[PDB]
Amino acid sequence: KGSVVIVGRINLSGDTAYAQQTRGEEGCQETSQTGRDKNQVEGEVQIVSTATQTFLATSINGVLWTVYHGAGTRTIASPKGPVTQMYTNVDKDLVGWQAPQGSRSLTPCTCGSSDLYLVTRHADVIPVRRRGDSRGSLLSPRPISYLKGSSGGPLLCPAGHAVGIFRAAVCTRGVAKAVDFIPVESLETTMRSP
């Protein structure tokens, strides 16, 4: 198992949502085997990779969360060496490490908002109608190809709180009609329990 490596970040703190790439696909492999990543971290959302796949990770409650079908059991690279996971729920498809220094956590939502926004690896923010605990409809249906590489990113309410973590797409003939996410309350349950 190599280490998960941060190769970029998305910021959600300004008047503008943007991505910024931090590591080429050559420093990634090196960082991955040694698990030592000296690069400074910033942002609420990290763009991360394993050997051939890239996806997202989201900071909430001082934990950097992502999807299990992404990270696996893997450590994540840090300035001090490889970081072992603090939380791992396979049934939930959930992984988390302690948030790296410089990673600002999103606050978990308490609004009850039904209007949501998905953040893509492209710092695109996409309108979503919450239809259940862990589902939301896309106002604009997008092709599946469009959403690939964005799992582990946040679903946000209109006040920019975290409602949950994008996990799977509900897809019909190559089109994404809706999204399934891990509710932010399941993250909190995961945090409280041995």
Ligand X SMILES: C=C[C@@H]1C[C@]1(NC(=O)[C@@H]1C[C@@H](Oc2ncc(OC)c3ccc(Cl)cc23)CN1C(=O)[C@@H](NC(=O)OC(C)(C)C)C(C)(C)C)C(=O)NS(=O)(=O)C1CC1
**Quick one: CA dihedral 29, 71, 119, 193, positive or negative?**
negative
Distance set, CA 127 to CA 10, 167, 177, 179 (Å): 18, 16, 12, 11
The reply to whether 59 belongs to the active site is no
- Catalytic residue, chosen from 3, 32, 93, 164, is 93
N- to C-terminal Cα separation, the chain: 25
Catalytic residue among 32, 134, 151, 153: 151
C-alpha span between 28 and 30 (Å, rounded): 6
State the binding partner of 109 from Zn ion, ligand X, none, CB within 5 to 8 A by kind: Zn ion
- Report d(CA 190, CA 22) in Å as an integer: 30
Whether 114 is a known active-site residue: answer no
Using DSSP, state whether 154 is helix, strand or coil.
strand
**Binder of Zn ion out of 111, 172, 185, 189 (CB under 5 A):** 111
Distances (CA, A) of 63 to 69, 81, 97, 113, 137: 18, 17, 6, 23, 27
Q: Does residue 175 touch ligand X according to CB under 6 A?
A: no
Least separation in angstroms between residue 46's CB and Zn ion is 22
For this structure, is 122 an active site residue? Answer: no
CA distance linking residue 122 with residue 63, whole number of Å: 22
In the block, tokens 């942002």 appear at: 43
* 3-state class (DSSP) for residue 187: helix
| Per-residue mark of binding to ligand X, 36-75 (x: CB under 6 A) | -----------------x-x-----------xxxx-----
167 binds, among ligand X, Zn ion, none (CB under 5 to 8 A by kind): ligand X
Stretch that binds Zn ion, among 50-58, 68-76, 110-118, 164-172 (CB under 5 A): 110-118
| Contact call for residue 171 and ligand X (CB under 6 A) | yes
Pick from ligand X, Zn ion, none: which does 86 bind, CB < 5 to 8 A by kind? none
Give the residues lining the site for Zn ion (CB under 5 A): 109, 111, 157, 159, 161
Question: Which residues participate in the annotated binding site for Zn(2+)?
Answer: 109, 111, 157, 161
Positions marked catalytic:
69, 93, 149, 151
Give the residues lining the site for ligand X (CB under 6 A): 53, 55, 67-70, 90, 93, 144, 147-151, 166-171, 180
